[PDB]
A and B are shown apart, each in its own frame.
Chain A
Amino acid sequence: MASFVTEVLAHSGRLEKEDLGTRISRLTRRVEEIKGEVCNMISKKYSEFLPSMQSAQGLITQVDKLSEDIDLLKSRIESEVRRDLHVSTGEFTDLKQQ
Chain B
Amino acid sequence: ELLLLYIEDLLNRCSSKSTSLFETAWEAKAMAVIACLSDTDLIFDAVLKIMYAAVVPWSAAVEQLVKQHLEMDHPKVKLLQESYKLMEMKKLLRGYGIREVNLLNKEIMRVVRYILKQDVPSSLEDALKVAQAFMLSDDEIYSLRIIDLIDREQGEDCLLLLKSLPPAEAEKTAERVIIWARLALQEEPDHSKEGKAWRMSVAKTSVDILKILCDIQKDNLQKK
Contacts and interface: CB of A to CB of B under 8 A. Distances in A.
For the residues of B in contact with A, the DSSP-based class is loop
B114 interface: yes
B188 interface: no
Interface in A1-60: 45-50
Interface residues of A, number: 6
A46 B148 CA distance: 13
A50 B113 contact: no
B165 interface: no
A46 B114 CA distance: 8
Nearest to A46: B113
A50 B100 contact: yes
Nearest to B96: A48
B107 A50 contact: yes
A49 B110 CA distance: 7
A39 B107 CA distance: 19
Interface in A35-89: 45-50
B42 interface: no
- A45, A46, A47 — which one has the most chain B CB atoms within 10 A of its CB? A47
Nearest to A48: B114
Contacts of A49: 107, 110
B117 A47 contact: yes
A97 B212 CA distance: 59
Interface string B87-102: 0000000000110100
Contacts of B98: 48, 50
Nearest to B107: A49
Contacts of A50: 98, 100, 107
Nearest to A45: B110
16 contacts: A45-B110, A46-B110, A46-B113, A47-B110, A47-B113, A47-B114, A47-B117, A48-B97, A48-B98, A48-B110, A48-B114, A49-B107, A49-B110, A50-B98, A50-B100, A50-B107
